[PDB]
């Protein structure tokens, strides 16, 4: 027998298992520096898009620019002699 | 040539298999037996089996005998 | 006696408690993690959680990357840069999961503790609590790879 | 409401409320999914810091000729690497930390109430468009000074005199991207009609 | 029957685990070949993945007829660290060496043997009734779908998990053989050539087959 | 209808992912939507043909443009039998020194695909004989499709 | 060919960037 | 041998064929 | 050899039509289920009643045609290729001799052509056909994937997802991250459609690689 | 007469199993069974495993109406007891499902006014043209 | 929600109503029948689509024909 139908919260076993009560266990010495470093980007579509538009541009940038390419047909690549078929 | 001749055979295959599908979507939806009573479309539906049965003979004839010869030759 | 029981009374709930579910150790450990606590800001978790996952992800790249031979330490930065991408990619994923599940208007859907007590729902549910976490993840995620590099060229 | 002469309709997002508004919002960015007037400062700070930009590269061709692209190259000042950058790092952030963190908290007028920097404030806020308007114009020339080096390479004024000497033969339309621009000019002539045919023909 | 959702779930994870690790490592080896970068493909010259334990086992048994097997003529069999044996100019049995390509295969044996356990166990535990079909027992051992409803029940019965198990049995064992047959031709069989002991395939396995390439 | 399959409310409300799968595959069927009158059914169709018809032209302008740019033409025009027609170059970030070289077969510098499409002769038997002609021609189909 | 630096600019943009954006935006539109 | 100048002209010309589709696909889906 | 093949070709055209001509005429109805006019066009079945209807619809009828379409075209494109190969290679005797019995098709046309293709990825080095050597494998793996959808039907997978949506749901650290759209084993018809896509995509890429890289390897 | 509320009837003895409620129950409806007992004995549980029913009126919580009638067909045809069940969902209100008329549907009662009937034989249905672009779910509606 | 509709042909055998695992079909009394009884489907909500109905109809061509509609939380029979 269980019931307490007045509460459907305890009938579902939905209880959060490993969630604790304890408040912040973290030091104020390092608190006040990060807590103000996170909200510089708080916003939905004007920031996530910065990651797509501005963030993914290093594929563009250092894919073309920096000469660290390894065996890339981009840059170093073909430098050796080209293969010719039997017929032509 | 090879890369072509095969292209236009396959791309011709799919198009016919779609010619019959929309042939079915026709009959399943926008065909009307009333206004078509006695037409040429209704005469075909009047004998379904004859068409179905004879294609079933020709496809079996070629089935046994064409395979039956390759196996005999093997 | 019998060691194994259904979770906390009712047998008809899906899971049932076992030594890796309800124990002295496992109850405490999984609860100590910067995950389940209800008493710390979500911004502070991302700067914790993401801070770790940058360091350990660098390793595979900075060790077994495409280019594992360089005389300038470039084999190490080639992994740092790419390991810094899964930092930048997952930020897109994290933030995306916020605009989907959580509506700014809808309240926190988290449930209430383990036993008898209803304690204030997970401060991270809605987009506000979530987005503060995402930027937090991005703050730490950059550090983890960074200190991984510093630990590569030093220490 | 001159409003860049598309014809009549501007989107509602730009009505002429904010200063300088000609109601041009092609990409629907002038909307407010987060804010808009944040763009105004972003325009303005760009604009402000831009309009003062030309002055450095402008006059240097006219005087001693270490022109801007070659300017930051040759000097004796920078002292053993980091001292060259490291000094310039702090002083901006420390005051920008104030105005950036402050004026998205202390109110949305970027250094307008001017509490950090007190001007003579004789003219003050009415003509403020004119500031914004005079810099936006210098913004566009600033792009040119790039291509002045890229396409030609001569100094901005050394390009001017060539246009003064031979007005017909110094155009972009001859050199390089001339073939490219003259197409972007054509496709910009029909541009107002396509935008207008939405309204009229719809 | 009561915790069954735990058993099946974990086994279902073990397969996906081996799916990418066991099999996928060939796809790496396949691809890194075709891109002209042999330095990468897991192999003997390249990245070493060797069956430590299995190799280490063969060490004991060739050291066995010393102390752990004091009364013997010699070790039990020659697949351990023994020496070659000939008859009629043929190799009776020589030893077998376990290299990287031997490593990668056993995990494919493991991959198939797990996946085919998933299917049969799931057939037993969900034979009675599953979470989606509570009556399933009353429909018999062998039945087609219940409905087209519920997105369709097609092939839910416990006769039908044996249907599926036979394609994984077939697959599992078939590769058990191709491992055998061409390991045994590579590293054992063939005529005794005196010098060279040339095998049937000339001893190409650990080099020959790493990727699905070969 | 709010959610993704805007055109059918039976899919529009589904808790599962079948809303997603059918939403893609039920799209182009215009006889089934919320309310599709006889008139507005012909509309989207006749608009769609402009889609297919424009997509084709760009696809052709690509073939022309690439052969005009990344491929050899003049060199082939001189020796149709003894040299291979080339298609777009092979850009992969993923190669070794060998596979780059081994694919540079052709007249060009980089790795390229010998083109088995066959389009390359139908230009010459119509006749062009400059990369300019191909580019000149590859612009129209870009324009015309517009 | 004279344009040679283009593929390095486009292919990453069209093989990754566009599939990154069209992965995000097409997702956010599945649920509204 | 194609002049580098022509190339960007074409790419910009095909850039317009990208917007006219976006303008179409909107108006068609907007219906 | 020319004679015997044209009957296979002729066979393939009939059994393809036989399927499609059936699906059209039985779209309206047949003796088993004469509701199909009003039951929709593409529907999974009428349920396991009165003999267990399956593939009873007219979409499932079309569905079966593709598998024959890919033969009767496969037979053609084969028979076209290897009559020409001999003619490009200067000999009419490879075909009309060995074309009669089915082993030459396997023993001569398939065995000789495969030697050049498989040497692309060869551990000794990359040939210029290494492009096609890989894809020819990509062609099978898709074809082989296609059987997982065609053979294994839904109810098995729907009980499997149940176990996973239970595990992800009650596992720690993944409690916090959940799905909006409840995952479900995809629909009956949806699989066959997905199944026949893999079957074809795999059926094409192998023969597209074999054909090109046989005539690119030899050059007729 | 027919409807009833939810008094306190205990739950049958069982030791827990992975079959049972899930995170539907939090946001979504779930069912409840109430029957009675005479002797105590064991019954198949449809969510898996076996459970001991008490000596008297009992109450269960299942996850599906489907699972629910599996257990009524169980006890009605085997131990020959009646059962009736409910629909409970988190907003707090409960509905009475199952013989809403007070009689099992298998047997006739009066007062039932049935829906979804057609007065035509099947062959007498409309063919899909005659509902075209006007629209209905199918030829059977019209 | 699935659609289920019933026809003149019913013998009133109840053999449908015994089949439905969700107890949709419910026997409504009637007149013209031999046994003077007709089924009916008050809940189209909970028809899962099993078509265990259509198997049970002793009638030559069915008295019930289930027409599958869209599929909800219930009509998918989800425990998730
Ligand atoms: C061309 C692709 C583009 C280029 C390639 C891009 C990569 C492709 C990535 C795949 C992207 C699409 C994936 C689709 C998967 C979903 C398929 C599905 O579940 O789709 C199944 C749908 C489900 O059917 C529809 O299902 C509907 C479901 O009902 C819905 O619709 C009803 C109708 O109103 C109501 O709205 C109701 O509320 C709602 O439930 C209805 O039943 C419709 O009547 C019924 O038609 O079926 C259909 O309609 C069938 C329509 C498909 C017919 C075409 C099949 C051809 C087979 C391919 C041929 C082989 C090709 C190989 C090529 C190899 C060479 C390269
Ligand atoms: C110009 C030709 C043409 C036109 C206009 C149509 C138009 C139509 N057809 Mg149709 N069809 C055609 C040709 C055509 N078809 C051909 C050639 C075939 C045979 C293959 C078919 C077979 C067919 C069937 C079987 C069905 C239709 C249906 C439909 C209708 C809806 C289509 C739909 O929902 O697609 C929406 C878009 C999709 C479903 C895209 C799915 C992608 C497919 C599966 C291909 C995936 C493979 C891919 C290419 C692989 C990529 C390879 C790469 C990864 C390497 C619509 C009226 C359906 C209908 O009306 O039902 C009521 C239907 O059931 N057609
Ligand atoms: C190689 C495989 C294969 C073969 C041989 C067939 C054969 C056939 N299919 Mg089929 N089919 C196949 C694959 C195959 N299919 C696949 C993969 C699909 C996709 C699902 C289909 C889909 C399909 C459809 C949809 C249809 C067919 C049809 C047919 C028949 C066409 C007529 C014909 O050629 O008869 C030739 C018959 C044979 C060659 C049988 C050979 C057996 C010998 C002659 C007798 C037995 C030998 C020996 C005595 C056995 C001893 C056993 C031992 C116990 C003593 C035929 C029975 C059509 C049909 O019904 O035709 C009427 C039809 O509608 N099939
Ligand atoms: C070649 C065909 C093929 C393949 C690849 C599979 C694959 C699979 N089957 Mg299987 N199956 C097949 C045929 C096949 N089947 C057939 C013909 C049948 C008929 C009997 C079945 C019947 C069957 C059953 C009954 C079961 C499976 C199961 C499985 C899964 C085991 C887990 C696993 O290995 O995942 C790992 C994935 C791989 C090994 C695929 C390799 C691909 C590479 C490594 C990853 C690609 C990287 C990246 C994502 C590339 C994409 C990027 C791109 C989008 C840009 C797996 C998805 C079992 C399952 O799901 O439970 C575990 C299961 O119960 N199948
Ligand atoms: C790890 C394996 C791998 C990977 C990742 C790549 C990656 C690539 N190869 Mg490649 N290659 C490989 C192995 C690999 N290769 C091997 C082993 C060989 C043999 C030696 C080659 C030979 C080779 C050649 C010869 C060429 C490439 C090319 C390419 C590039 C094509 C990219 C592109 O245009 O995307 C676009 C990709 C597609 C359009 C096809 C995918 C279809 C998608 C996935 C279906 C989805 C459709 C649906 C509507 C969803 C829409 C998606 C949405 C995001 C828009 C890309 C960089 C090409 C290149 O560099 O220039 C183009 C080229 O010509 N490769
Ligand atoms: C549909 C035709 C088509 C196809 C299949 C390709 C295929 C390819 N092009 Mg391409 N191209 C085309 C037309 C086409 N081109 C046209 C008309 C132009 C003139 C602007 C170009 C200009 C161009 C350049 C400058 C380059 C390529 C390159 C490439 C290769 C890598 C993919 C890439 O970077 O594309 C990127 C291409 C663009 C951004 C141009 C716009 C896209 C064109 C118009 C095709 C759009 C059709 C498509 C269905 C649109 C749907 C998009 C979305 C809804 C899915 C690949 C072989 C690269 C290459 O050769 O490196 C090896 C490269 O550097 N293309
Ligand atoms: C057009 C498609 C495309 C392109 C351009 C690339 C490009 C690359 N791949 Mg890749 N890949 C692709 C498709 C593609 N891939 C697909 C489809 C698969 C799955 C089948 C893979 C699987 C794969 C693997 C498994 C690996 C690669 C690797 C690589 C890198 C080659 C090795 C190297 O020099 O790294 C050296 C790289 C650097 C020195 C720096 C790169 C960092 C850039 C400049 C920063 C990017 C910024 C941006 C935030 C990135 C996120 C994008 C997103 C946010 C929009 C190169 C960046 C290797 C790699 O990443 O290792 C490093 C590697 O191990 N690929
Ligand atoms: C020839 C190519 C082609 C053309 C002309 C269209 C045209 C159209 N599509 Mg479409 N589509 C295509 C390919 C194409 N599609 C492919 C390859 C896919 C992926 C398989 C889709 C997936 C798709 C979806 C998911 C939807 C459309 C829709 C539409 C319509 C609105 C335009 C739009 O998407 O925005 C329009 C009829 C929308 C619609 O419902 O039409 C009104 C819509 O929701 N399409
Ligand atoms: C099933 C379906 C749904 C409902 C309506 C719909 C009509 C679509 C119906 C039909 C669908 C389809 C695709 C039906 C037919 C398809 C096919 C295979 C059509 C092919 C017909 C072939 C024909 C004539 C050939 C006729 C004769 C020819 C060339 C030869 C002529 C000649 C000979 C033999 C020697 C040379 C000189 C000369 C005199 C010209
Ligand atoms: C494997 C399998 C599944 C499980 C397969 C699933 C759930 C597909 C999902 C796999 C991942 C999540 C997606 C695969 C990645 C694709 C590349 C996605 C393509 C996306 C485009 C369509 C846009 C079924 O649901 C099924 C149903 C009926 C008959 C046979 C089968 C069957 O064989
Ligand atoms: S498989 Fe699909 S069709 Fe064949 S019985 Fe099961 S449900 Fe009916
Ligand atoms: S429907 Fe079929 S079974 Fe149900 S009562 Fe009428 S006749 Fe008897
Ligand atoms: S199909 Fe719908 S109606 Fe027929 S039995 Fe199953 S649930 Fe009751």
UniProtKB/TrEMBL annotation, chain H:
It holds the Pfam family PsaM. One of its GO terms (biological process) is photosynthesis. Keywords: Chloroplast, Membrane, Photosynthesis, Photosystem I, Plastid, Thylakoid, Transmembrane, Transmembrane helix. It is a single-pass membrane protein. It comes from the Eukaryota. The keyword Transmembrane helix applies. One of its GO terms (cellular component) is chloroplast thylakoid membrane. InterPro entries: PSI_PsaM, PSI_PsaM_sf. The chain crosses the membrane at residues 5-25. Its main location: plastid. Coiled coil: none annotated. It is found in: Plastid, Chloroplast thylakoid membrane. HAMAP family: PSI_PsaM (MF_00828). Belongs to the PsaM family. This is Photosystem I reaction center subunit XII. It comes from Bryopsis plumosa (Green alga). The gene is psaM.
């Amino acid at each position: 027998r269980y019931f307490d139908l007045d509460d459907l919260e305890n009938t579902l076993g939905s209880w959060d298992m490993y969630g604790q009560e304890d408040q912040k266990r973290y030091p104020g010495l390092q608190n006040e520096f990060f807590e103000r470093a996170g909200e510089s980007l708080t916003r939905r579509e004007a920031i996530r898009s910065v990651l797509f538009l501005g963030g993914g541009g290093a594929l563009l940038a250092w894919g073309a620019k920096g000469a660290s390419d390894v065996t890339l047909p981009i840059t170093v690549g073909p430098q050796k002699g080209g293969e010719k078929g039997p017929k032509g | 040539q090879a890369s072509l001749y095969t292209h236009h055979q396959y791309i011709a295959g799919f198009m016919l298999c779609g010619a019959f599908a929309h042939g079915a979507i026709f009959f399943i939806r926008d065909y009307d037996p009333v206004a078509n009573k006695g037409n040429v479309l209704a005469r075909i539906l009047d004998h379904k089996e004859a068409i179905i049965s004879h294609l079933s003979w020709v496809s079996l004839f070629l089935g046994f005998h064409t395979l039956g010869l390759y196996v005999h030759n093997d | 006696k019998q060691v194994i029981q259904p979770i906390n009374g009712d047998p008809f709930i899906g899971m049932l408690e076992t030594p890796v579910t309800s124990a002295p150790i496992v109850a405490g450990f999984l609860s100590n993690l910067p995950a389940y606590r209800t008493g710390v800001s979500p911004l502070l978790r991302g700067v914790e959680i993401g801070l770790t996952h940058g360091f350990l992800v660098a390793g595979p790249f900075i060790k077994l990357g495409p280019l594992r031979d360089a005389a300038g330490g470039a084999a190490e930065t080639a992994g740092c840069l790419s390991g810094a991408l899964l930092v930048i990619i997952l930020t897109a994923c994290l933030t995306i999961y916020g605009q989907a599940t959580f509506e700014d208007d809808e309240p926190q859907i988290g449930v209430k503790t383990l036993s008898g007590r209803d304690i204030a729902r997970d401060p991270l549910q809605s987009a506000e609590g979530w987005n503060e976490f995402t930027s937090g993840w991005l703050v730490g995620g950059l550090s983890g790879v960074a200190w991984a590099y510093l630990c590569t060229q030093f220490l | 409401r001159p409003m860049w002469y598309p014809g009549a309709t501007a989107p509602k997002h730009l009505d002429g409320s904010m200063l300088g508004d000609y109601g041009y919002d092609p990409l629907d960015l002038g909307a407010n999914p987060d804010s808009l007037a944040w763009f105004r400062e972003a325009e303005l700070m760009n604009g402000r810091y831009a309009m003062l930009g030309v002055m450095g590269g402008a006059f240097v061709n006219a005087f001693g000729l270490p022109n801007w692209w070659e300017a930051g190259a040759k000097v004796d000042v920078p002292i053993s690497l980091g001292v060259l950058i490291a000094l310039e790092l702090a002083i901006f952030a420390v005051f920008e930390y104030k105005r950036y963190e402050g004026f998205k908290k202390t109110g949305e007028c970027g250094v307008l109430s001017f509490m950090p920097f007190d001007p003579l404030n004789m003219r003050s806020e009415e003509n403020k468009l004119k500031e914004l308007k005079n810099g936006r114009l210098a913004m566009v020339a600033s792009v040119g000074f790039i291509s002045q080096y890229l396409v030609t390479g001569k100094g901005p004024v050394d390009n001017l005199k060539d246009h003064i000497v031979d007005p017909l033969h110094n155009n972009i339309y001859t050199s390089s991207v001339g073939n490219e621009v003259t197409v972007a000019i054509v496709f910009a002539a029909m541009w107002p009609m396509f935008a207008e045919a939405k309204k009229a023909l719809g | 029957i009561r915790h069954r959702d735990a058993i099946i779930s974990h086994l279902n994870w073990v397969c996906i685990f081996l799916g990418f690790h066991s099999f996928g490592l060939y796809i790496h080896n396949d691809t890194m070949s075709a891109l002209g970068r042999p330095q990468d493909m897991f192999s003997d010259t390249t990245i070493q993945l060797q069956p430590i334990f299995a190799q280490w086992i063969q060490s004991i048994h060739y050291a066995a007829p010393q102390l752990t097997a004091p009364t013997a003529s010699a070790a039990t069999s020659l697949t351990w660290g023994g020496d070659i044996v000939s008859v009629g100019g043929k190799v009776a049995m020589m030893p077998i060496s376990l290299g990287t390509s031997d490593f990668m295969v056993h995990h494919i044996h493991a991959f198939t043997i797990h996946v085919t356990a998933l299917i049969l166990l799931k057939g037993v535990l969900y034979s009675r009734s599953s979470r989606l079909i509570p009556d399933k027992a009353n429909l018999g051992f062998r039945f087609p779908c219940d409905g087209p409803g519920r997105g369709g029940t097609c092939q839910v019965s416990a006769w039908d998990h044996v249907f599926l198990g036979l394609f994984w049995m077939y697959n599992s064992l078939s590769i058990v053989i191709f491992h055998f047959s061409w390991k045994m031709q590579s590293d054992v069989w063939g005529t005794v050539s005196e010098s060279g002991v040339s095998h049937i395939t000339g001893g190409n396995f650990a080099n020959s087959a790493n990727a699905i390439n070969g | 209808a709010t959610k993704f399959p805007k055109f059918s409310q039976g899919l529009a409300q589904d808790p599962t992912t079948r809303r997603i799968w059918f939403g893609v595959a039920t799209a182009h069927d215009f006889e089934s939507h919320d309310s599709i009158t006889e008139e507005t059914l012909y509309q989207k169709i006749f608009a769609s043909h402009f889609g297919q018809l424009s997509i084709i032209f760009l696809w052709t302008s690509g073939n022309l443009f690439h052969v005009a740019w990344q491929g050899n033409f003049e060199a082939w025009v001189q020796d149709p039998l003894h040299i291979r027609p080339i298609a777009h170059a092979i850009w992969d970030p993923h190669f070794g020194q060998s596979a780059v070289e081994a694919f540079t077969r052709g007249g060009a510098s980089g790795p390229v695909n010998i083109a088995t499409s066959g389009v390359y002769q139908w230009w010459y038997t119509i006749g062009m004989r400059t990369n300019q002609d191909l580019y000149q021609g590859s612009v129209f189909l870009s324009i015309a499709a517009g | 060919m004279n344009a040679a630096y283009l593929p390095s600019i486009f292919v990453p943009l069209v093989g990754l960037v566009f599939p990154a954006i069209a992965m995000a935006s097409a997702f956010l539109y599945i649920e509204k | 041998s194609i002049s580098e100048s022509q190339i960007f002209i074409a790419i910009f010309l095909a850039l317009i064929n990208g917007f006219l589709a976006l303008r179409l696909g909107s108006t068609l889906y907007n219906s | 050899g020319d004679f015997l093949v044209h009957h296979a070709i002729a066979l393939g055209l009939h059994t393809t039509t036989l399927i499609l001509v059936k699906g059209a005429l039985d779209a309206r109805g047949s003796k088993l289920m004469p509701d199909k006019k009003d039951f929709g066009y593409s529907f999974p079945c009428d349920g396991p009643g009165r003999g267990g209807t399956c593939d009873i619809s007219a979409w499932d009828a079309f569905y079966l045609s593709v598998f024959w379409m890919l033969n009767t075209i496969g037979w053609v494109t084969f028979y076209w290729h290897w009559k020409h190969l001999g003619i490009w290679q200067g000999n009419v005797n490879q075909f009309n001799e060995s074309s009669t019995y089915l082993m030459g098709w396997l023993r001569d046309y398939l065995w000789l052509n495969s030697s050049q293709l498989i040497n692309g990825y060869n551990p000794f080095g990359m040939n210029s056909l290494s492009v096609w050597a890989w894809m020819f494998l990509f062609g099978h793996l898709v074809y082989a994937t296609g059987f997982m959808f065609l053979i294994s039907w839904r109810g098995y997978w729907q009980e499997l997802i149940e176990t996973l949506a239970w595990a992800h749901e009650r596992t720690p650290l993944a409690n916090l991250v959940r799905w909006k759209d409840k995952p479900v084993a995809l629909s009956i018809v949806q699989a066959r459609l997905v199944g026949l896509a893999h079957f074809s995509v795999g059926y094409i890429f192998t023969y597209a690689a074999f054909l090109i890289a046989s005539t690119s390897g030899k050059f007729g | 007469t027919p409807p009833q509320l939810d008094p306190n009837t205990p739950s049958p003895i069982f030791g827990g199993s992975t079959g049972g409620l899930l995170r539907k129950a939090q946001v979504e409806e779930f069912y409840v069974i109430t029957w009675e007992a005479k002797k105590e004995q064991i019954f198949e549980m449809p969510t898996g495993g076996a459970a001991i029913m008490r000596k008297g009126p009992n109450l269960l919580k299942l996850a599906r109406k489907e699972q629910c009638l599996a257990l009524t067909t169980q006890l009605r045809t085997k131990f020959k007891t009646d059962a009736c069940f409910y629909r409970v969902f988190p907003s707090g209100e409960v509905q009475y499902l199952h013989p809403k008329d007070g009689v099992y549907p298998e047997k006739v009662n009066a007062g039932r006014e049935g829906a979804n009937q057609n007065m035509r034989s099947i062959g007498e249905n409309v063919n899909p043209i005659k509902v075209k672009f006007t629209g209905k779910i199918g030829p059977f509606d019209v | 929600s699935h659609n289920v509709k019933i026809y003149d042909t019913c013998i009133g055998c109840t053999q449908c109503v015994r089949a439905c695992p969700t107890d949709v079909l419910e026997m409504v009394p009637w007149d013209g029948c031999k046994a003077k009884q007709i089924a009916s489907a008050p809940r189209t909500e909970d028809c899962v689509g099993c078509k265990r109905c259509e198997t049970a109809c002793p009638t030559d061509f069915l008295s019930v024909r289930v027409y599958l509609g869209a599929e909800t939380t219930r009509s998918m029979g989800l425990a998730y």
